[PDB]
Structure formats: structure tokens, C-alpha cells
Write a protein that binds this ligand. Sequence first.
Ligand SMILES: CCCCCC/C=C\C=C/CCCCCCCC(=O)O[C@H](COC(=O)CCCCCCCCCCCCCCC)COP(=O)(O)O[C@@H]1[C@H](OC(=O)CCCCCCCCCCCCCCC)[C@H](O)[C@@H](O)[C@H](O)[C@H]1O[C@H]1O[C@H](CO)[C@@H](O[C@H]2O[C@H](CO)[C@@H](O)[C@H](O)[C@@H]2OP(=O)(O)OCCN)[C@H](O)[C@H]1N
Ligand SMILES: CC(C)CCC[C@@H](C)[C@H]1CC[C@H]2[C@@H]3CC=C4C[C@@H](OC(=O)CCC(=O)O)CC[C@]4(C)[C@H]3CC[C@]12C
Ligand SMILES: CC(C)CCC[C@@H](C)[C@H]1CC[C@H]2[C@@H]3CC=C4C[C@@H](OC(=O)CCC(=O)O)CC[C@]4(C)[C@H]3CC[C@]12C
Ligand SMILES: CC(C)CCC[C@@H](C)[C@H]1CC[C@H]2[C@@H]3CC=C4C[C@@H](OC(=O)CCC(=O)O)CC[C@]4(C)[C@H]3CC[C@]12C
Ligand SMILES: CC(C)CCC[C@@H](C)[C@H]1CC[C@H]2[C@@H]3CC=C4C[C@@H](OC(=O)CCC(=O)O)CC[C@]4(C)[C@H]3CC[C@]12C
Ligand SMILES: CC(C)CCC[C@@H](C)[C@H]1CC[C@H]2[C@@H]3CC=C4C[C@@H](O)CC[C@]4(C)[C@H]3CC[C@]12C
Ligand SMILES: CC(C)CCC[C@@H](C)[C@H]1CC[C@H]2[C@@H]3CC=C4C[C@@H](O)CC[C@]4(C)[C@H]3CC[C@]12C
Ligand SMILES: CC(C)CCC[C@@H](C)[C@H]1CC[C@H]2[C@@H]3CC=C4C[C@@H](O)CC[C@]4(C)[C@H]3CC[C@]12C
Ligand SMILES: CC(C)CCC[C@@H](C)[C@H]1CC[C@H]2[C@@H]3CC=C4C[C@@H](O)CC[C@]4(C)[C@H]3CC[C@]12C
Ligand SMILES: CC(C)CCC[C@@H](C)[C@H]1CC[C@H]2[C@@H]3CC=C4C[C@@H](O)CC[C@]4(C)[C@H]3CC[C@]12C
Lengths: 34, 44, 419, 48
Amino acid sequence: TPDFSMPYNVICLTCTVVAVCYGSFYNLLTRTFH
Amino acid sequence: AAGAAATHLEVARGKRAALFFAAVAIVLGLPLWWKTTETYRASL
Amino acid sequence: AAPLVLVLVVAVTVRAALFRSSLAEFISERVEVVSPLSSWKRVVEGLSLLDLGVSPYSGAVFHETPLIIYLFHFLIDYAELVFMITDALTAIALYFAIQDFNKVVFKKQKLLLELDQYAPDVAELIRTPMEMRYIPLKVALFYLLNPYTILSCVAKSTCAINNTLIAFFILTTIKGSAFLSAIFLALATYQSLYPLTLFVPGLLYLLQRQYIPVKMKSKAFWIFSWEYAMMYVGSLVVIICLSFFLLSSWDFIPAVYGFILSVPDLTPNIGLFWYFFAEMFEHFSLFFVCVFQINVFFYTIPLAIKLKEHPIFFMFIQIAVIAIFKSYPTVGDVALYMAFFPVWNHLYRFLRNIFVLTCIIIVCSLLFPVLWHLWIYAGSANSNFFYAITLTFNVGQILLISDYFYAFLRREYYLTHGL
Amino acid sequence: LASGHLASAFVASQEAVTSSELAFFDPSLLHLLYFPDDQKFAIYIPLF
Ligand SMILES: CCCCCC/C=C\C=C/CCCCCCCC(=O)O[C@H](COC(=O)CCCCCCCCCCCCCCC)COP(=O)(O)O[C@@H]1[C@H](OC(=O)CCCCCCCCCCCCCCC)[C@H](O)[C@@H](O)[C@H](O)[C@H]1O[C@H]1O[C@H](CO)[C@@H](O[C@H]2O[C@H](CO)[C@@H](O)[C@H](O)[C@@H]2OP(=O)(O)OCCN)[C@H](O)[C@H]1N
Ligand SMILES: CC(C)CCC[C@@H](C)[C@H]1CC[C@H]2[C@@H]3CC=C4C[C@@H](OC(=O)CCC(=O)O)CC[C@]4(C)[C@H]3CC[C@]12C
Ligand SMILES: CC(C)CCC[C@@H](C)[C@H]1CC[C@H]2[C@@H]3CC=C4C[C@@H](OC(=O)CCC(=O)O)CC[C@]4(C)[C@H]3CC[C@]12C
Ligand SMILES: CC(C)CCC[C@@H](C)[C@H]1CC[C@H]2[C@@H]3CC=C4C[C@@H](OC(=O)CCC(=O)O)CC[C@]4(C)[C@H]3CC[C@]12C
Ligand SMILES: CC(C)CCC[C@@H](C)[C@H]1CC[C@H]2[C@@H]3CC=C4C[C@@H](OC(=O)CCC(=O)O)CC[C@]4(C)[C@H]3CC[C@]12C
Ligand SMILES: CC(C)CCC[C@@H](C)[C@H]1CC[C@H]2[C@@H]3CC=C4C[C@@H](O)CC[C@]4(C)[C@H]3CC[C@]12C
Ligand SMILES: CC(C)CCC[C@@H](C)[C@H]1CC[C@H]2[C@@H]3CC=C4C[C@@H](O)CC[C@]4(C)[C@H]3CC[C@]12C
Ligand SMILES: CC(C)CCC[C@@H](C)[C@H]1CC[C@H]2[C@@H]3CC=C4C[C@@H](O)CC[C@]4(C)[C@H]3CC[C@]12C
Ligand SMILES: CC(C)CCC[C@@H](C)[C@H]1CC[C@H]2[C@@H]3CC=C4C[C@@H](O)CC[C@]4(C)[C@H]3CC[C@]12C
Ligand SMILES: CC(C)CCC[C@@H](C)[C@H]1CC[C@H]2[C@@H]3CC=C4C[C@@H](O)CC[C@]4(C)[C@H]3CC[C@]12C
């Protein structure tokens, strides 16, 4: 069985991981060394 | 005269990548969210 | 010469020893090693259903392509030899591809020297022939002696054939043949859908080998691109039409590609989809599946804008992204991009926080089976432990890839502007 | 009814009541089947 108490924490955690990847790639692809 | 060309090129490429990001974001995220999460009501 | 043969002998010996032990049955059933699209038991189930007069795609257990059916129909008895052969094949292809690539790199770096476009004090960043001598042999060893690859081989997972096809695509591309490259890319796209993203890097490498400039006002560029795309699409069309005539049905198509795209089965794995869609509000499921499958195809275009002059590093990053963000991932997909780390280890001085990431990945790998046991057999744990471990594993992978990309860019900056 | 044709008026009124009550009692008009519009921000914030 899954956990019936936390359908809402799972969304936040998984979206947080996807956001981590997005932020890394955007920061690396858009900026330049000064 | 290599360094100036190589700073100019990298700045331009960064600009292009940022513009792609913004364009795809608006052009897909708004219509997709609007069309997949809407309450469909017919006409009365 | 002798080192490669010795490496092959050792790898084959280890696989043969593990095939005969009392751990083969235990290994064959791990959720980290097999998937609904890779299990051997589903292969034999489909073959039996064909002998009972039932279509293999009329149920919910078999999701393989017809070509796998044909091959294993003719070679069910010799199954354990096939996987050893395929692993050796992919190792050898990687070896020769890396040799050719190193030649190109040293020649390209040597040519720049006389055009004196490098900074005055940039040395100890220059490649030397003595350090590139053993990179290909290392690459072969990292693929063959990775525990992930050995585990995949003993379980007889289909992922090995996919890895072999990708390696042959790389070999044929670097050797400069476009027809064979298109054929192998089509065969890789036929088996799994995501490899279509590797179309752009191979085209860029071929164009760079021809010395054709890549510009919007060029004529050779457009002609070459059109020919390559036509060959690839025709390959796909012919393979699909041929697949129709094995069973005279189109039923394999929803069973394979629809299954990959829609994610109906919720069996646990090392990925990010199963627990998310077992705990979903039904109102938002369509939106979220669309977002999380766009994420895979998302990065190709900006990465091609930034990495236009470095197609092979681009390939490496794309393969890692596919492995991380696919719907039904396995460690066999993970091993393929880990085989490329020796090629990029001249960037070690600019790497930061490599130690902690390696330790974290190693710990999560061991923590998968223990928590699976405590949840499924002891009954003392729940699914939250396993979900936490999957989250940590994926985060570590992402951080490691980002580190490598940063180090590459930093070295380029120092080469151009001065150390 | 204004024109004085009783039979046609009777039939038309029968059809009117049938259609109106068919529309009113439809099983899909239950408010409980749909996600509350109040809690949608909870869902869109994490990836926005
Ligand atoms: C390194 C960088 C990491 C990157 C991201 C981090 C990802 C993973 C790392 C850490 C975890 C973070 C995410 C974890 C969230 C889920 C996991 C969890 O917390 O659960 C617990 C798992 O235990 C562990 O996490 C650790 C064990 C081993 C894993 C190690 C961690 C990784 C290690 C890898 C590397 C280590 C070293 C390497 C270095 C070399 C299990 O506990 P439990 O189930 O008892 O508790 C839950 C639950 O608790 C929580 O989930 C915590 C809430 C927030 C957690 C998120 C963390 C915040 C930030 C973390 C920071 C990390 C770093 C990031 C920065 C880089 C929760 O509170 C409850 O909601 C949940 O339900 C509860 O379960 C139980 O509670 C209820 C009461 O018992 C019960 O409910 C039922 O009963 C009630 C009756 O009273 C009813 O009202 C209910 O309706 C309900 O239904 P019922 O009628 O009973 O029906 C029963 C039918 N079965 C639940 O049943 C019960 N299960
Ligand atoms: C952007 C969308 C519609 C995707 C499809 C790409 C087209 C816009 C491409 C396909 C063929 C291209 C053309 C192919 C060849 C040329 C000739 C080129 O000029 C020369 O060849 C001049 C030769 C010389 O005098 O040296 C100028 C660009 C142009 C019109 C290209 C413009 C861009 C075209 C139409
Ligand atoms: C080569 C690539 C770029 C696309 C072109 C390949 C086509 C030859 C194939 C690919 C997908 C196929 C389609 C996939 C699914 C269906 C549904 C299928 O509908 C059914 O009858 C299925 C269920 C039933 O039999 O009742 C009819 C054929 C069709 C349109 C197929 C027709 C042939 C298609 C277009
Ligand atoms: C390389 C480029 C040019 C094309 C690559 C091929 C794909 C674009 C095609 C090939 C087979 C197609 C699939 C064949 C059959 C189906 C089933 C069809 O109906 C379903 O059963 C959907 C699943 C569901 O909703 O449950 C939905 C589209 C889909 C997944 C198709 C989506 C598009 C696919 C992946
Ligand atoms: C380069 C090509 C592959 C297009 C770019 C990728 C995305 C823009 C498209 C291509 C295929 C699409 C997928 C094809 C099939 C499906 C199954 C579809 O499932 C259903 O409709 C069934 C019910 C449900 O699960 O919601 C959900 C969307 C999804 C994942 C699509 C999401 C958007 C995707 C990833
Ligand atoms: C598959 C791809 C090519 C098509 C999808 C649409 C995307 C890629 C298009 C739509 C609008 C486009 C942008 C429109 C205008 C400009 C300004 C120009 O000075 C550089 C390119 C740039 C920033 C374009 C980049 C590509 C772009 C973001
Ligand atoms: C994740 C990547 C790789 C694929 C697609 C990314 C884009 C198109 C998606 C990912 C997450 C999406 C957002 C998620 C949530 C919301 C909140 C909602 O109230 C409006 C739309 C909005 C703001 C979405 C817009 C489109 C969006 C930005
Ligand atoms: C026949 C099928 C089943 C398997 C093929 C495997 C063997 C025959 C193939 C796979 C990869 C191939 C190599 C790939 C690249 C090169 C470099 C080229 O400059 C000379 C040939 C050489 C060295 C090839 C020789 C043949 C080769 C070793
Ligand atoms: C069945 C498995 C083993 C595949 C075998 C090789 C396949 C991919 C071969 C057999 C016939 C080939 C096709 C024959 C002719 C053409 C026309 C040409 O203008 C483009 C390539 C294209 C469309 C080829 C693509 C590759 C192809 C489909
Ligand atoms: C053209 C490619 C490269 C990029 C465009 C994105 C495509 C593949 C994606 C983006 C949004 C998607 C749609 C989003 C939602 C729905 C509603 C329902 O009917 C299921 C399919 C359908 C209709 C999707 C079909 C595929 C879709 C159109």
C-alpha cells in the first residue's frame, strides 16, 4: 500500500527536485564568466 | 584581438538561450495549463 | 593489445562465474535492475502465449517489440551467451571510437597552437600524447567492470542490447558514415523512444568533419541536413512497416510507445514517477504527465546553442539526462554515461564537491536493497523510506553532472583568456 | 394555447416538462465531483 496521509508533500518534493535541475541548467547556460 | 571576439560571441549566445527559455515558457505553459485544467461549460 | 584481451577475459570469467551460482535467481528479480520493459520472464511469457494461440499484446504483462520476439524465438536456448557477446561488442566499439576521437582532439588542438589564439601562459592545460595513451582501455574497463553492468547481464535484461545499439551509433558516427549512423539511430529509437534527441549532436559532428560551416545563409549545410533527416525517417518507416507483418497487427504500437508515454504501471523503481502518480489528485494528472515528459526533450535546443563546437560533450550530457528523467529507468542506463568519465578526467582540477557526491551515490546504491527488504518482507518499514532513497539518488546524479559541465566551461575560459 | 388548439398545446407542454426535468436531475450536476477552486494555488505554487 502507499501512504494515504501525504498526497500533498510528494508533489512539493518531486517538483523541488525538478526545479533544482532547471535552476542549475539555466544558470550554467545563460551566464558568462567575468 | 581574440579575447574581444570571444567575449562578444559568448554574450550573444547567452542572450539567445535566455530568449528561448522565456519564449517556450510562456508559449507552452500558459495554453497547456489553461486547456488541461479548465471547467468545460457549454452554452445556455 | 594484450591489455584489451586480458580485460575481456576477466569480464567474461566474472559473468560466467556469476551465472552458475545461487544468486542468479535473486539478482533476476530486483526492481532496480529490471523493468516492465526489460524483464526476461515477460519474454518467455509472450513466447508461451504465442504457442497457446493468444496474441502477446492482448494482456497486460508483455511490452516488447517484435524484433526481440524474432531474435529470442531463434535463440532461446543460447540466451546466456548472447548477453556476454553484446557486452563485449559495446566495450570494443567504445574503445575504437575513443581512439579516433583522441586523434581528432590532439590534431585540432595542435592546429590552434600555430594560429596562436591561446594565451601566453596557458600551459599545463595543454593535452599531451603521453596522457591520452590509456584513455580508451580505461573506458572499456569502466564499462565492463561496473557492478551495474554485471548485474544487468546476469539478469538477462534487454537494456544491454539498447546500450550496444547506442555504442554502435557513436562508433559509426565518429568513423564518418552517415547511412549507418542513421540506421543505428533508427534502431535505437524503435526500441526506446527517447534516443531521438541524439539526432542533433551527431549531425553537428558530421558537419564539422566535412568542414562545412554552420550558418543560416549556407547552402551545403541545408542539403546535408535534409539528406541526413530523410535517411533517418525512412529507416524508421521501413522498420515499422516490417514489424507489422510479423503478426499482421498494429497492436504492438500502443503496447510499447503508449506504455512508455502514459506510465500506467506503478511498480517501484529508482525513478521519479511511480510514487508521484500513486499519490496524485486526479484533476491534475494529465497536466503533470505532459510537463514531466516535456522535461526530457526540453534541454536539447539551448544545449545545442551553447555547445555548438563540442558535439561529443553534448552527447554525454544528453545521455545522462535521458538516463535520469526517463519513465522506467534502470541501472543499466546509468552505466552507459558513467563509462564516459575517463574521457573528461583532465578537468579534475576545476571540479568541486566531487568527493561528497561520490560517497552519497555509493551509499544510496547499498541502501536500496536493505530498505526494500524491510518494507516488503519484514513489514517494519513503509514506502516513504524507499521514496526518500530514490530522491537522494537522483539529486546526487544531477549535482554530479552539473559539476562536470561547470568544469568544462571554466577550462575553456582559462584557455582563451589566461590562467 | 393562445390560438385555441388544445391538443397540440398539450403535447408540447408534455415535451417541455420532460426535457426540463431531464436536464435538472442529471447525475453530473453534483457539486461533490469536482476539485475545489480554493485549493488550486497549493498545487500550482511548487513548480511555478
Ligand atoms: C542529501 C540531499 C537530500 C535531497 C532531498 C532529500 C530526500 C531524502 C532525504 C531525506 C528525507 C527527506 C524526504 C523524506 C520524506 C518522506 C520520508 C519520511 O520522512 O518518512 C520516514 C522515512 O524515514 C527516513 O526518511 C530516513 C530513513 C532512511 C533514509 C535515509 C535518508 C537518506 C540517506 C541517504 C544518504 C545518508 C548518508 C549519505 C552521506 C554519506 C518514515 O517515518 P514515518 O512514516 O513514521 O513518518 C511519516 C511522515 O514523516 C515525514 O515524512 C516527515 C515530513 C517532512 C519530511 C521532509 C523533510 C523536509 C526537508 C528534508 C531535508 C533534506 C535535505 C535537503 C536539502 C539538500 C509524516 O510526518 C506523516 O504525514 C506520515 O504519514 C508519517 O507516517 C505515519 O504517520 C501517521 C501517523 O502514524 C499515519 O497516518 C495514518 O494513521 C492516522 C491515524 O492517527 C490517520 O489519521 C491517517 O489517515 C493515516 O491513515 P490510516 O487510517 O492509519 O491507514 C493505515 C493503513 N496503512 C501513517 O500511516 C504513518 N505511516
Ligand atoms: C525557418 C523554417 C522555415 C525552417 C526551414 C528552413 C528554411 C528557412 C531554409 C531552407 C533552405 C534555406 C535557403 C537555402 C539557400 C539559400 C541561399 C543563400 O544564398 C546563397 O546561396 C547565395 C550564394 C552566393 O552568392 O554565394 C541565402 C539563404 C537561402 C535562401 C536559405 C534561406 C533559409 C532556407 C529557406
Ligand atoms: C515513420 C514515422 C515517422 C510515422 C509513420 C509510421 C506509420 C507507417 C505508422 C506509425 C503509427 C501508425 C498508426 C498507429 C495506430 C493506429 C491505430 C489503428 O487503429 C486500430 O484499428 C487499433 C485497434 C483496433 O484494431 O481496433 C489503425 C492504424 C493506426 C492509425 C496506425 C497507422 C500506421 C502508422 C501511422
Ligand atoms: C522520430 C519521429 C519523426 C517520430 C517518432 C515516432 C513517434 C512520433 C510515434 C511512433 C509511435 C507513436 C505512438 C503509437 C501509438 C500510440 C497510442 C495512442 O493511443 C493510446 O493508446 C494512447 C495511450 C493512452 O492514452 O492510454 C496514442 C498515441 C501513441 C502513444 C503514439 C504516439 C506517437 C508515437 C510514439
Ligand atoms: C519531439 C517530440 C517527442 C515532441 C516533444 C515532446 C512533447 C512536447 C510531447 C511528445 C510526446 C508527448 C506525450 C505523448 C503521450 C502522452 C500520454 C498522455 O496520456 C493520456 O492522455 C492518458 C491519460 C493520462 O494519463 O492523463 C499524456 C500526455 C503524454 C505523456 C504526452 C506529453 C507531451 C509529449 C511528451
Ligand atoms: C525548434 C525551435 C527552433 C523552434 C521553437 C521556438 C523557439 C526555439 C524560437 C521561438 C522564438 C525564437 C526567438 C525569437 C527571436 C530571437 C532574437 C534573435 O536575436 C536571436 C534568436 C531569438 C532569441 C529566437 C530564438 C529561438 C526562439 C526562442
Ligand atoms: C519542466 C520543463 C522541462 C518542461 C515544461 C516547462 C514549462 C512549459 C512548464 C513547467 C511548469 C509549468 C508551470 C507550473 C504551474 C503553473 C501555475 C499555473 O497556475 C499557471 C501555469 C504555471 C505557471 C505553469 C506554466 C508552464 C510551466 C512553467
Ligand atoms: C559482425 C558483427 C556481429 C559485430 C562487429 C564487430 C567488429 C567486427 C567491429 C565492431 C567495431 C569495429 C571497428 C570500429 C572502428 C575501426 C577503426 C577503423 O579505422 C578500422 C576498423 C575498426 C578497427 C573496426 C574493425 C571492426 C570492428 C571491431
Ligand atoms: C530490420 C533491421 C535489422 C533494420 C535493417 C536495416 C534497415 C534500417 C534498412 C533496410 C532498408 C533501408 C532503407 C533503404 C532505402 C532508403 C532510401 C534512402 O533515400 C534513405 C534511407 C532508406 C530509407 C533506408 C533506411 C534504412 C533501411 C530501412
Ligand atoms: C511538436 C512537438 C515537438 C512539441 C509540441 C508538444 C506536444 C508533443 C504536446 C504538448 C502538449 C500536449 C497535449 C497536452 C494535453 C492533451 C490533452 C489530451 O487530449 C491528451 C493529449 C494532449 C492533446 C497532448 C498531446 C501532445 C501535446 C500537444
